[PDB]
Design goal:
It is a single chain. It contains 9 helices and 16 strands. It is an alpha+beta fold. The protein is globular. The protein binds cacodylate ion (CAC) and fe (iii) ion (FE) (2 copies). It comes from Pseudomonas aeruginosa (strain ATCC 15692 / DSM 22644 / CIP 104116 / JCM 14847 / LMG 12228 / 1C / PRS 101 / PAO1). Its EC number is 3.1.2.32. InterPro entries: Metallo-B-lactamas, NDM-1-like, RibonucZ/Hydroxyglut_hydro.
């Protein structure tokens, strides 16, 4: 009752498209206007598209697509659905936009997204990554998407050096991507995802704690959190990061290698993302996190 984990309508203005493991959120801005939030994985294009069209009879009414960060599982749908969305404008940070103009970077994103295709699956036709209708948004920028939707852009680096989150001040609703970590569905706690910069990761969570009380907290994976899970989310994510650090120091101090400890974390936590993150990459991300924290 504190996490909404079924695709479909979540609120009067808000729907979850696709699978809850890598969801795309649909906002109704008006009678003839909509926005998407989060960019998904490429293999989900036809599923997300099918869901979309059952809510939006005219896809030319999809006007904005908000993107938290450049990781392959948060922008993989863009080249494949943007062509079907003639009036969409993609909103993303400056650093996120940069990645889509680099071929070495685009090659990685496309290669990862391809590893996720189902047996015998075919991707739609992709427009050019460097032709996406992007508009760079800045830290603190107010996005007036509609008469009842004003969302603030907030820089939230640490998980990645480009990550931003989008805060609907009216609805107390935060789209937070992976900045709080991965929500542990069985245990109800955040699993830290410190893959770039520990100091920035914690600083972002400090700032996000100072927002007005959250009523809805929407990460990049797992659905919508509400009640105390939203109100306490940023603070709990901070606590869980410090906790992992303290426990890492214990385990290392007893002689456990980063090799064994990363494999242990991989076994403990890889299960939730098995269907959208190759296990070798989850393991490597665990290893990088433990290196950063150490
Ligand atoms: C692919 As990930 C662990 O940054 O959500
Ligand atoms: Fe990520
Ligand atoms: Fe992610």
């Amino acid at each position: 009752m504190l996490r909404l984990s079924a695709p479909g309508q979540l609120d009067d203005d808000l729907c979850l498209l696709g699978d809850v493991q890598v969801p795309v959120f649909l906002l109704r801005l008006g009678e003839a206007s909509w926005a998407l939030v989060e960019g998904g994985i490429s293999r989900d294009a036809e599923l997300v598209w099918a869901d979309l069209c059952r809510w939006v009879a005219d896809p030319s009414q999809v006007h904005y697509w908000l993107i938290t960060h450049k990781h392959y599982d948060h922008c993989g749908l863009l080249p494949y659905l943007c062509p079907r969305l003639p009036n969409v404008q993609v909103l993303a940070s400056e650093r996120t936009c940069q990645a889509w103009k680099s071929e070495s970077a685009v090659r990685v994103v496309e290669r990862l997204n391809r590893q996720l295709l189902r047996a015998e699956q075919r991707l739609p036709e992709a427009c050019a990554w460097d032709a996406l209708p992007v508009r760079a948004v800045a830290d603190g920028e107010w996005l007036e998407l509609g008469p009842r939707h004003r969302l603030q852009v907030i820089e939230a680096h640490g998980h990645s050096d480009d990550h931003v989150v989008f805060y609907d001040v009216r609805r107390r609703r935060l789209f937070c991507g992976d900045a709080l970590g991965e929500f542990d569905e069985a245990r109800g706690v955040w699993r830290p995802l410190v893959f770039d910069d520990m100091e920035a990761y914690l600083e972002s969570l400090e700032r996000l704690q100072r927002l007005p009380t959250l009523l809805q907290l929407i990460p990049g994976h797992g659905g919508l959190l509400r009640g105390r899970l939203a109100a306490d989310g940023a603070e709990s994510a901070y606590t869980e990061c410090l906790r992992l650090c303290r426990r890492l120091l214990w385990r290392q101090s007893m002689g456990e290698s980063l090799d064994e400890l990363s494999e242990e974390l991989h076994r403990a936590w890889g299960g939730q993302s098995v269907d959208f993150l190759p296990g070798e990459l989850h393991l490597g991300s665990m290893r990088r996190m433990l290196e950063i924290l150490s």
